Design an enzyme around this catalytic site. Sequence first.
Site, mmCIF file in Angstrom:
data_model
loop_
_atom_site.group_PDB
_atom_site.id
_atom_site.type_symbol
_atom_site.label_atom_id
_atom_site.label_comp_id
_atom_site.label_asym_id
_atom_site.label_seq_id
_atom_site.Cartn_x
_atom_site.Cartn_y
_atom_site.Cartn_z
ATOM 1 C CG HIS A 231 3.973 -16.030 20.375
ATOM 2 N ND1 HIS A 231 3.821 -14.822 20.152
ATOM 3 C CD2 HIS A 231 2.890 -16.291 21.638
ATOM 4 C CE1 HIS A 231 2.665 -14.219 20.822
ATOM 5 N NE2 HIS A 231 2.282 -14.973 21.658
ATOM 6 C CB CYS B 34 -0.617 -0.012 1.176
ATOM 7 S SG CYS B 34 -2.121 1.592 1.271
ATOM 8 C CE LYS C 256 -5.181 -2.278 4.960
ATOM 9 N NZ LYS C 256 -4.838 -1.506 3.747
ATOM 10 C CG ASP D 243 -7.268 0.756 1.008
ATOM 11 O OD1 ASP D 243 -7.453 -0.079 0.112
ATOM 12 O OD2 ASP D 243 -6.513 0.320 1.936
ATOM 13 C CB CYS E 245 -3.266 -1.738 -1.760
ATOM 14 S SG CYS E 245 -4.444 -0.690 -1.029
ATOM 15 C CG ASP F 256 -0.171 -12.016 20.647
ATOM 16 O OD1 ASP F 256 -0.321 -13.153 20.063
ATOM 17 O OD2 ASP F 256 0.313 -12.357 22.179
ATOM 18 C CE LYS G 166 -6.463 1.489 5.768
ATOM 19 N NZ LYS G 166 -5.577 1.544 4.466
ATOM 20 C CG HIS H 244 -7.490 6.462 18.258
ATOM 21 N ND1 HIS H 244 -8.280 7.307 19.139
ATOM 22 C CD2 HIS H 244 -8.281 5.303 17.858
ATOM 23 C CE1 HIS H 244 -9.441 6.734 18.922
ATOM 24 N NE2 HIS H 244 -9.407 5.940 18.314
HETATM 25 ZN ZN ZN Z 1 -3.949 0.773 0.228
HETATM 26 ZN ZN ZN Z 2 -7.952 8.884 20.441
HETATM 27 ZN ZN ZN Z 3 0.991 -13.975 22.903
#
Ligand code: ZN
Ligand code: ZN
Ligand code: ZN
Lengths: 222, 218, 221, 218
Positions: free
Chosen positions: D218, D40, D183, D92, D61, D192, D154, D162
């Site tokens: 993991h 992207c 997305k 996008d 993209c 994670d 998205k 944020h």
């Molecule tokens: Zn993109």
């Molecule tokens: Zn915020």
């Molecule tokens: Zn973990």
Amino acid sequence: GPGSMDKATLAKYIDHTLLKADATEEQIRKLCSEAAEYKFASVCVNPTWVPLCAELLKGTGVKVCTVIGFPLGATPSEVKAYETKVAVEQGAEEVDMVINIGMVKAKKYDDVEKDVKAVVDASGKALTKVIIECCYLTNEEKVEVCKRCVAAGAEYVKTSTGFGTHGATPEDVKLMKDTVGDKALVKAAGGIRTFDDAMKMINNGASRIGASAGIAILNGIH
Amino acid sequence: MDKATLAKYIDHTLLKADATEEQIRKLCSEAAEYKFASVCVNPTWVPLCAELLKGTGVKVCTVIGFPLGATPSEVKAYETKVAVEQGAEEVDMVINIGMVKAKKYDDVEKDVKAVVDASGKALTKVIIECCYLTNEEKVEVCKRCVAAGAEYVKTSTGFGTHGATPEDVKLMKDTVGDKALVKAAGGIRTFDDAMKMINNGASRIGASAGIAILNGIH
Amino acid sequence: PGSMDKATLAKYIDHTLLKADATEEQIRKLCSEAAEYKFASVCVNPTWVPLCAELLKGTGVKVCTVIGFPLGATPSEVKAYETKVAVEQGAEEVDMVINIGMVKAKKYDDVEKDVKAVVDASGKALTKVIIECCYLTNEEKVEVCKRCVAAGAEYVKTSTGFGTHGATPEDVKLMKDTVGDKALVKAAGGIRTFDDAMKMINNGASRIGASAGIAILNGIH
Amino acid sequence: MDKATLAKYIDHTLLKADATEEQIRKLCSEAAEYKFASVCVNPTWVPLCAELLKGTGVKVCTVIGFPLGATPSEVKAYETKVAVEQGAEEVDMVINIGMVKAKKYDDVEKDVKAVVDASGKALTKVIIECCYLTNEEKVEVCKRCVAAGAEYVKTSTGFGTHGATPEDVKLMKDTVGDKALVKAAGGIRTFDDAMKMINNGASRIGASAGIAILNGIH
Ligand SMILES: [Zn+2]
Ligand SMILES: [Zn+2]
Ligand SMILES: [Zn+2]
Ligand code: NA
Ligand code: NA
Ligand code: NA
Ligand code: NA
Ligand SMILES: [Zn+2]
Ligand SMILES: [Zn+2]
Ligand SMILES: [Zn+2]
Ligand SMILES: [Zn+2]
Ligand SMILES: [Zn+2]
């Protein structure tokens, strides 16, 4: 008679200044080369560059000036004195200290005088200038600080660091010179970019001009 | 993230040249009330803050050779010695940028080491002033800070052209790994700003807006 | 004597709102303020051009908008189309962002072409070119400014206000030294006070981009 | 979950204004090596990426009206037409948030439809920029994206206050059901983090840290 301001005369007002934190060896060497060619009164540089400048300017007539507790003035007197001792040892011929503004706002003027006197003592044969940083002071504070600088034995009072919210004003120069009379000299610094700017300061009582634009100032004479 | 945990990232800072005793007293009062990590003040205010904060868990942090970094190593060292004698528990020094631009990195390290030596039991943070450095310079300075024994590298003085960027924090943290900690400072005004820094590797945040940061959690 | 007054200072100010989440109510307020204080312009994102053009009819305040903003990283033909539409909808000045990738590749003829595409599309509207000083070396600032003059842009502009930092007095002086009187310089980003504004003006700026223009006027000293 | 499968969730992203040709070439090299879903990049780099990624299985993209979304629909549509002609396989776009705040949701929908029509064979994703929306607004915007025919919604641009939150991903997926995909982008740094977004309904992940995400399995 002396006639109009000319190059030889105006040059002796100029402290050719470079104080940016990221100034380089090459820029400091160029500053010295410029000052020697133009016969400026001094270069003004941060303490780290003093002994290089002293070596480069030996024999040129240009003095080495440096700044102490600069630009905030917010460190103990003994520290300002120590920086002064080291700078003079390393070749500084003038030192420009910043006042402790917190002392001024606390009205601890005896302490302001003692802070200046600590630097005056450490300066030895070097001349002392005291930056009062006008942009952060009331007019009453400007006056009382200037009196304390004279009482402490400083040769000069100085308008500004160039790092605060604003620099030299002709009104401040005049107030300062009216306060000290012939007992001290006045240095105008900060935002002085042109021949006309420099003359306005000189006409209000400045005996020295702090600038990065010294070349432009000297070359704008008419 | 809860308020008590976030608060212990924050160095509650006031460094303006015209800061008053009344402002410094309020800064200390706030730090103790909100349980911030430290106050960060100019060296003239170390004795007052040390007295006010005794027993509160809030450390006294001060700044050395600040904000320009352009004074001899021995002067930085003396300022540090005085500050620690007067009660400073952390000292944040500014590097000599001229040495960096000359590629005299052994000299940069000795300059840091001079302050580390003088700090004694106090922690040393080194302000690298990212806004005036290239990426190559940031990385090498950080390596020299670890070599000299500094506990922290710090993004910025807050007096340069700009302060902390998340990208700078990550680069600094990638360089030092777990050998040192990273402090992000300057321009950090909101909770979201603070978290961008923390999530990129910052262990400490320098700010004036600590109270607003705590109250902005979301 | 000859000190800056409020009427004179107001004509330096481009009263600016460019946040992605800006609201109709905020844009209406921006226009009402600019009319009252006789600022040079409002500066808004292209979506708000027709509203501002309608609101500022009969006021002296220009409608300025931004082009390829804030990243500059879209083809010249897209910048040119955005300009055409903006001018059709009432824009009187357009502030494009350069393609920084071209600068870093030292493809300065391509930078000039990118600016010329916008200049050609601008028609009656004036063109300002944002060079985004925070991401450029000094050599790059100089060469970009030269290419802006070559392309025929009326203004060069320090910053978007979205990068790492905005206007510096040193950047304003470098840009003005480069363009002379062949172009004008706009300083933008991080200008919060009268003293900030004057530092820019005294170093060569003919226009100031800010959101704090009312406070700037109120802060004259 | 293994490395090859996770890699095909990832859009390997570089969108900084000062990104260089060298960095974009490295991005493409990496995406082809690790077999990410896409790169992207900003529209200016579409032709180069298209050339470099021929036969690699990695899609090009690009982003439209990005990151502010505050330009007329016909401009977003034209940028889209050019991008697809230049070799973009996915686009996008950013929504017009001023329309959302004025509750002009038929106009929001028309804005998305302009890009959808312009995308032709390329897939359309719609960045709703959750950090600036209320929950009610997120829901309504997602409904309009489905109505306008976008394949994806998205979370974020990564340039706002944020980025992706798991709660937003869940809200978005709950709203669109199986009629669109989600997305998650912005602030996804670790294995994670990525798995948390996937668990909440993300079918794609936007990130710059793809290699670290794969290496953290993991
Ligand atoms: Zn993109
Ligand atoms: Zn915020
Ligand atoms: Zn973990
Ligand atoms: Na003396
Ligand atoms: Na120590
Ligand atoms: Na034009
Ligand atoms: Na399509
Ligand atoms: Zn000096
Ligand atoms: Zn002022
Ligand atoms: Zn004259
Ligand atoms: Zn500190
Ligand atoms: Zn504009």
